Scaffold this active site. Structure first.
Site, PDB file in Angstrom:
ATOM      1  N   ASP A 224     -54.708  48.316   3.346  1.00 39.74           N
ATOM      2  CA  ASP A 224     -54.831  46.684   2.893  1.00 39.74           C
ATOM      3  C   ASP A 224     -55.741  45.680   2.264  1.00 39.74           C
ATOM      4  O   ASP A 224     -56.842  45.331   3.589  1.00 39.74           O
ATOM      5  CB  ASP A 224     -54.232  45.917   4.217  1.00 39.74           C
ATOM      6  CG  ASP A 224     -53.681  44.968   4.275  1.00 39.74           C
ATOM      7  OD1 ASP A 224     -54.335  43.825   3.327  1.00 39.74           O
ATOM      8  OD2 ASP A 224     -53.601  44.148   5.404  1.00 39.74           O
TER       9      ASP A 224
ATOM     10  N   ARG B 158     -55.459  48.569  12.191  1.00 41.65           N
ATOM     11  CA  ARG B 158     -54.316  48.566  11.995  1.00 41.65           C
ATOM     12  C   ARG B 158     -54.229  48.940  10.243  1.00 41.65           C
ATOM     13  O   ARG B 158     -53.129  49.177   9.518  1.00 41.65           O
ATOM     14  CB  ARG B 158     -53.378  47.038  12.663  1.00 41.65           C
ATOM     15  CG  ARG B 158     -54.263  46.287  11.839  1.00 41.65           C
ATOM     16  CD  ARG B 158     -53.867  44.814  12.062  1.00 41.65           C
ATOM     17  NE  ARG B 158     -54.536  43.732  11.429  1.00 41.65           N
ATOM     18  CZ  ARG B 158     -56.000  43.046  12.738  1.00 41.65           C
ATOM     19  NH1 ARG B 158     -56.154  43.950  12.992  1.00 41.65           N
ATOM     20  NH2 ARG B 158     -57.038  41.943  12.039  1.00 41.65           N
ATOM     21  N   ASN B 159     -55.276  49.045   9.898  1.00 44.79           N
ATOM     22  CA  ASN B 159     -55.705  48.607   8.306  1.00 44.79           C
ATOM     23  C   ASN B 159     -56.693  49.631   7.268  1.00 44.79           C
ATOM     24  O   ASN B 159     -56.977  50.032   6.857  1.00 44.79           O
ATOM     25  CB  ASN B 159     -56.276  47.296   8.049  1.00 44.79           C
ATOM     26  CG  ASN B 159     -55.781  45.520   8.237  1.00 44.79           C
ATOM     27  OD1 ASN B 159     -54.574  46.205   8.075  1.00 44.79           O
ATOM     28  ND2 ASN B 159     -56.338  45.016   8.445  1.00 44.79           N
TER      29      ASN B 159
ATOM     30  N   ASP C 116     -61.100  42.216   6.447  1.00 47.45           N
ATOM     31  CA  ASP C 116     -60.138  42.986   7.199  1.00 47.45           C
ATOM     32  C   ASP C 116     -59.522  43.923   8.101  1.00 47.45           C
ATOM     33  O   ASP C 116     -58.555  44.370   7.736  1.00 47.45           O
ATOM     34  CB  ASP C 116     -58.116  42.474   6.699  1.00 47.45           C
ATOM     35  CG  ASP C 116     -57.345  42.527   7.486  1.00 47.45           C
ATOM     36  OD1 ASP C 116     -56.129  41.972   6.979  1.00 47.45           O
ATOM     37  OD2 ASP C 116     -57.957  42.102   9.211  1.00 47.45           O
TER      38      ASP C 116
HETATM   39  N1  LIG Z   1     -49.769  53.551   2.140  1.00 50.60           N
HETATM   40  C1  LIG Z   1     -49.531  53.936   3.913  1.00 50.60           C
HETATM   41  N2  LIG Z   1     -48.786  54.477   4.383  1.00 50.60           N
HETATM   42  C2  LIG Z   1     -48.186  54.644   5.555  1.00 50.60           C
HETATM   43  N3  LIG Z   1     -48.218  53.344   6.392  1.00 50.60           N
HETATM   44  C3  LIG Z   1     -48.612  52.202   5.817  1.00 50.60           C
HETATM   45  C4  LIG Z   1     -49.163  52.303   4.445  1.00 50.60           C
HETATM   46  N4  LIG Z   1     -50.065  51.083   4.376  1.00 50.60           N
HETATM   47  C5  LIG Z   1     -49.038  50.556   5.406  1.00 50.60           C
HETATM   48  N5  LIG Z   1     -48.204  51.639   5.636  1.00 50.60           N
HETATM   49  C6  LIG Z   1     -47.738  50.305   7.388  1.00 50.60           C
HETATM   50  O1  LIG Z   1     -47.886  49.584   7.693  1.00 50.60           O
HETATM   51  C7  LIG Z   1     -48.399  48.681   8.186  1.00 50.60           C
HETATM   52  C8  LIG Z   1     -48.803  47.226   7.461  1.00 50.60           C
HETATM   53  O2  LIG Z   1     -49.159  48.135   6.352  1.00 50.60           O
HETATM   54  P1  LIG Z   1     -50.427  46.778   5.299  1.00 50.60           P
HETATM   55  O3  LIG Z   1     -51.108  47.032   5.911  1.00 50.60           O
HETATM   56  O4  LIG Z   1     -50.395  46.991   3.621  1.00 50.60           O
HETATM   57  O5  LIG Z   1     -49.770  45.285   5.083  1.00 50.60           O
HETATM   58  P2  LIG Z   1     -49.664  44.626   5.306  1.00 50.60           P
HETATM   59  O6  LIG Z   1     -51.626  43.755   3.630  1.00 50.60           O
HETATM   60  O7  LIG Z   1     -48.478  43.572   3.535  1.00 50.60           O
HETATM   61  C9  LIG Z   1     -50.041  42.445   6.208  1.00 50.60           C
HETATM   62  P3  LIG Z   1     -50.733  41.924   7.006  1.00 50.60           P
HETATM   63  O8  LIG Z   1     -51.715  41.696   6.030  1.00 50.60           O
HETATM   64  O9  LIG Z   1     -50.304  40.457   7.561  1.00 50.60           O
HETATM   65  O10 LIG Z   1     -51.155  43.111   7.673  1.00 50.60           O
HETATM   66  C10 LIG Z   1     -49.570  49.462   8.685  1.00 50.60           C
HETATM   67  O11 LIG Z   1     -50.396  48.914   9.551  1.00 50.60           O
HETATM   68  C11 LIG Z   1     -49.148  50.235   8.409  1.00 50.60           C
HETATM   69  O12 LIG Z   1     -48.632  51.601   9.631  1.00 50.60           O
HETATM   70 MG   LIG Z   2     -52.404  41.893   3.070  1.00 48.70          MG
HETATM   71 MG   LIG Z   3     -52.437  45.002   7.304  1.00 56.45          MG
END
Ligand SMILES: Nc1ncnc2c1ncn2[C@@H]1O[C@H](COP(=O)(O)OP(=O)(O)CP(=O)(O)O)[C@@H](O)[C@H]1O
Ligand SMILES: [Mg+2]
Ligand SMILES: [Mg+2]
Ligand SMILES: Nc1ncnc2c1ncn2[C@@H]1O[C@H](COP(=O)(O)OP(=O)(O)CP(=O)(O)O)[C@@H](O)[C@H]1O
Ligand SMILES: [Mg+2]
Ligand SMILES: [Mg+2]
Lengths: 291, 291
Positions: free
Chosen positions: B163, B149-150, B145
């Site tokens: 992520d 965004r990640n 992934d």
């Molecule tokens: N440690 C962190 N510090 C700051 N912002 C964070 C962060 N972790 C996540 N974010 C913010 O939250 C968003 C979503 O986080 P994450 O990527 O972990 O989602 P997720 O895995 O829960 C769901 P999906 O797989 O659908 O994205 C990131 O793109 C970022 O903007």
């Molecule tokens: Mg996830």
């Molecule tokens: Mg994500």
């Protein structure tokens, strides 16, 4: 843009191709020009075309026009890339220049660290560029961006000074002083140009010394390991690059002469040509050969 | 859920805050963790907490556990977000990770299209992520992934791969093939992963190429104007994205190398790191500067 039939080229006879230059951003491309050579009407010629980058400003255009006009004015010389024509009407500005099949000097030298370079060949490259610059200086014009990346090599290994993007006509002032702005090749610039913003044929000489260093290191990067931002302090301290391994002591002193702290004490391109000719002739007539 | 004292964190010392991520759904939040840092006992630390969405299924939980376990196993690296702890007992599952004060890479880049990004900065971001992925790949794990965004950015502009929701340990199989289901980031997926459902380090490389594109377009969206559903046909036709304006020709070819139709012909993260290091060093030591 004003019309100028003399250099205007029919777009219809021009077909753009792939981008040129590893370190470039795609605004310079290879291209086929049918009829570019007055003599051969239907004969297509492979050329190079420079255009504005996607999202060009007002000055950007102004700078490409100047580059073109500079090339138009200086006249032909064996060691300066030739302007072939331009597409300025009813469309994007295209500056057509002859194509150099072996790329810029840096890529060319790095590839032969594939017919390897000999000491003689390095002196020859240097001699040719000194001739090109001697000619440019005789037209009372400065280049301001002399560097390996701005030197092209033809199919027959001829050195061609190119990219007149920063070149200026100093026929009426004898020296150019910028008050504007823009990114500049600081590692190739003389202290007076960097600190006093003053450019002259002597500042081009300084740049020629850096070019000599690039040539003898076979496409090396000036002031190795030194972040560009750290150079300013070093220069104020009088720092100068060490001699490249492939450089004779005599050529290194020529290099250091190009970097004399006093502009007027640096040799002139005329003098560099005369000394380089002597050195080239001697090397050509006396080099040791592998049997 | 099984206990694991090593990473368990006292809920009482954790206080949830505001949601994070514009495009997120609120399951990731900012939070204050008192004592999370073994050294500082009473010192509160701002962290990020990921939890299950309101109405989580059976697999949903299974996927968050895996994400946590993956982070536990891979070990520390400067360019990978750090797992700080987790609340798994007597309550909702909370995965605590270090907080990146400048958000995800996309938000970060878009905001500097406010200290604007320079070519050097873009290469630096790319270099750091290649290092992070090189490290991940050396652990024989795939991310699956990789996308702007990640990627998170710290207060000091350090790039952090994050992520690990789709990450898999392929130490025993050398390649992961899913037969299950679930939504996937198709616009970041290699053809073989999309069509053959096969994932490897080479499919992560493909994804890295898309990431490079996002970086050089300053947070742009891959395959512009193309509805996700239309991509499949284009890929079968061999379609590849055009070069971003801010990208040199050399970096675009690196990008295209990441998208080679033959997985084994794509460069490895090890090779990408070596090439990106060369490019970063040269740019750092030769860039033009505005005086
Ligand atoms: N440690 C962190 N510090 C700051 N912002 C964070 C962060 N972790 C996540 N974010 C913010 O939250 C968003 C979503 O986080 P994450 O990527 O972990 O989602 P997720 O895995 O829960 C769901 P999906 O797989 O659908 O994205 C990131 O793109 C970022 O903007
Ligand atoms: Mg996830
Ligand atoms: Mg994500
Ligand atoms: N006539 C030509 N034949 C072959 N390659 C050429 C060429 N003109 C340019 N190139 C290649 O493209 C590169 C960039 O060209 P050029 O030096 O004209 O750029 P430029 O003035 O548009 C921008 P900058 O001033 O930032 O370099 C050269 O270093 C060389 O590799
Ligand atoms: Mg140039
Ligand atoms: Mg220019």
């Amino acid at each position: 843009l004003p019309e100028d039939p003399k250099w205007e080229f029919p777009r219809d006879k021009l077909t753009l191709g792939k981008p040129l230059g590893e370190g470039a951003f795609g605004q310079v491309v290879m291209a086929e020009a049918v009829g570019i050579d007055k003599d051969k009407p239907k004969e297509a010629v492979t050329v190079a075309v420079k255009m504005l980058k996607d999202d060009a400003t007002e000055k950007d255009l102004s700078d490409l026009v100047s580059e073109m006009e500079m090339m138009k004015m200086i006249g032909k010389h064996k060691n300066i890339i030739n302007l072939l024509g331009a597409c300025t009407q009813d469309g994007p500005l295209y500056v057509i220049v002859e194509y150099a099949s072996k790329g810029n000097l840096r890529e060319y030298l790095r590839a032969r660290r594939e017919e390897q370079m000999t000491f003689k060949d390095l002196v020859s490259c240097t001699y040719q560029l000194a001739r090109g610059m001697e000619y440019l200086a005789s037209q009372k014009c400065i280049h301001r961006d002399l560097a390996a990346r701005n030197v092209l090599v033809t199919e027959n290994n001829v050195m061609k000074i190119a990219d007149f993007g920063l070149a200026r006509d100093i026929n009426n002032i004898d020296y150019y002083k910028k008050t504007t702005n823009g990114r500049l090749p600081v590692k190739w610039m003389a202290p007076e140009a960097l600190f006093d913003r003053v450019y002259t044929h002597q500042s081009d000489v300084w740049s020629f010394g850096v070019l000599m260093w690039e040539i003898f290191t076979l496409g090396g990067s000036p002031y190795p390991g030194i972040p560009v931002e750290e150079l300013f302090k070093l220069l104020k301290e009088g720092h100068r690059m060490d001699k490249p391994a492939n450089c004779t002591n005599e050529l290194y002193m020529m290099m250091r002469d190009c970097w004399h702290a006093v502009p007027s004490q640096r040799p002139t391109f005329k003098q560099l040509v005369e000394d380089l000719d002597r050195i080239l002739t001697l090397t050509t007539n006396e080099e040791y050969l592998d049997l």
